[PDB]
Design a protein around this ligand. Structure first.
Ligand SMILES: COc1ccc(S(=O)(=O)NC(=O)c2sccc2SCc2ccc(Cl)c(Cl)c2)cc1C(=O)O
Length: 285
């Protein structure tokens, strides 16, 4: 199981799709088993102090990879946020994969962004989907909003067909200021799940190209911060790999980052979607 030449990969996809996606099912089942013989601790996520900081009780942040907040005077657990570094193709810790912030963790969320020198946010969910609460709004509708010692100012917005780009300037009262740009994918079906990959490919390319040398990791979140988040991470990384080596290793890369945050790429449908995105990128020449 190693890099497939980019020229065979598209044929590989035909094979994975055939006989009612039997191949895809094998692969993804292998993904879900890939940690069967691994005990990976998440003690901090489970500590009684940090429970209210987890959006879902079963979606945790592995200890070894968890992003740490600088501790606060005089609580012991003021260092916890449900978030993990994840590798990209290029560098280690190219991403912070995290849950959609809760109101109760908005300060942590922006503090992490400051401390980690993050300059790009990728949001892959709407606040509400199909009448359900997915994410609380951690940014100002207009002008400024204060979260702890970080003051966030919305500078501009461009609303595209399928996603929105908001440019913020944030300030640490401790002032020192930084630009943070948020790429927010907004197109989510009332019924069923996303199907066409091309708009997503474009969203990935543009949000990825926005990364600045040399800055902190890109923050990527959806609701739980695992399924759609992992899908973005694999598509982005594999495009890097294709550009660099003209090979692809979806199954191997995904098994790897699965050790860094639980459940990255959560469904077979997302797993298939990854391939469609990459197929679109390869066929588009
Ligand atoms: C149990 O977990 C889940 C179950 C279902 C869903 S779901 O909402 O029903 N199903 C999905 O999300 C699917 S299906 C094919 C594609 C997708 S998401 C496609 C997509 C869209 C925009 C971007 Cl930027 C990217 Cl990178 C990828 C999402 C999750 C999740 O946790 O992310």
């Amino acid at each position: 199981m190693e890099a497939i030449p980019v020229k065979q990969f598209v044929k590989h996809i035909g094979e994975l799709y055939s006989n009612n996606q039997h191949g895809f099912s094998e692969d993804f089942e292998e993904v879900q088993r890939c940690t069967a013989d691994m005990n990976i601790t998440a003690e901090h996520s489970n500590h009684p102090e940090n429970k209210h900081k987890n959006r879902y009780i079963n979606i945790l942040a592995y200890d070894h990879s968890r992003v740490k907040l600088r501790p606060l005077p005089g609580s012991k657990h003021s260092d916890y946020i449900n978030a993990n570094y994840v590798d990209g193709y290029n560098k280690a810790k190219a991403y912070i994969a995290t849950q959609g912030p809760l109101k109760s963790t908005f300060e942590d969320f922006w503090r992490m962004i400051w401390e980690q020198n993050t300059g790009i946010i990728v949001m892959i969910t709407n606040l509400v989907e199909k009448g359900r609460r997915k994410c609380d709004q951690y940014w100002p509708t207009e002008n400024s909003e204060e979260y702890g010692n970080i003051i966030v100012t919305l500078k501009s917005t461009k609303i595209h067909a399928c996603y929105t780009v908001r440019r913020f300037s944030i300030r640490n009262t401790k002032q020192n200021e930084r630009v943070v740009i948020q790429y927010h994918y907004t197109q989510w079906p009332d019924m069923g799940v996303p199907e066409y990959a091309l708009p997503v490919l474009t969203f990935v390319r543009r949000s990825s190209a926005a990364r600045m040398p040399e800055t902190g990791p890109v923050l990527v979140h959806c609701s739980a911060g695992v399924g759609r988040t992992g899908t973005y991470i694999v598509i982005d990384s594999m495009l890097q790999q294709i550009k660099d080596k003209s090979t692809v290793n979806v199954l191997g890369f995904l098994k790897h980052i699965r050790t860094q945050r639980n459940y990255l790429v959560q469904t077979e449908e997302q797993y298939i979607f990854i391939h469609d995105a990459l197929l679109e990128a390869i066929l588009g020449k």
